[PDB]
Amino acid sequence: VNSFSGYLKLTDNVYIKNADIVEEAKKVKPTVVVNAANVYLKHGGGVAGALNKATNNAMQVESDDYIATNGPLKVGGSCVLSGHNLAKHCLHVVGPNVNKGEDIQLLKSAYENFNQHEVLLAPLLSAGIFGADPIHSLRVCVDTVRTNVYLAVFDKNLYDKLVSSFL
């Protein structure tokens, strides 16, 4: 039993809610919140900009040190950093950004990172300003992640569309 509330059950292990992931994180303090990162960990907009703002830019400061030491992530890759005031850990996951011309095929690899964590609070990877088809991303999610994932979808119309079209 865990402390996620008001989530609609999609599958054995995937639940979904129309909610602001920052507010969910501040409420639940999950072990892991997922960030929809880019390879440089430059947290400008979308999930990343929103999470980082909620940490008072501490996420960005930590991320800049990570990149200075380790170099960029791979598209499809991830790293574990602090969750600051939002969670114990933040799993920064790089899905493909279709608006950068990146290979949507790498979305499955991106979701595989979730399997290294028993429970996660997460956004829908590559959705929104990452420009992928969100129905497709939800399918790849449910068909790839085997651990317990709680998805927070910001946009109400998007949430309604995702629920109504889910197979």
Ligand X SMILES: O=C(O)C[C@H](NC(=O)c1ncnc2[nH]ccc12)c1ccccc1Cl
- Contact residues for ligand X, defined by CB under 6 A: 20-22, 36, 46-47, 50, 123-124, 127-130, 153-155, 158
Least spacing, CB of residue 1 vs ligand X, in Å: 26
Least spacing, CB of residue 52 vs ligand X, in Å: 11
Q: Nearer to ligand X by C-beta: 89 or 134?
A: 134
Structure token pair of residue 52: 């980082």
Query: Listing from the earlier edge strand, what are the strands of the sheet with 119-122?
Result: 8-9, 14-18, 148-153, 119-122, 32-36, 89-93, 78-82
Q: Nearer to ligand X by C-beta: 39 or 158?
A: 158
Q: Nearer to ligand X by C-beta: 65 or 74?
A: 74
d(CA 137, CA 139): 5
CB 162 within 8 A of CB 35: no
Least spacing, CB of residue 124 vs ligand X, in Å: 5
Tokens 């440089």 map to which residue?
Answer: 40
Q: Nearer to ligand X by C-beta: 14 or 21?
A: 21
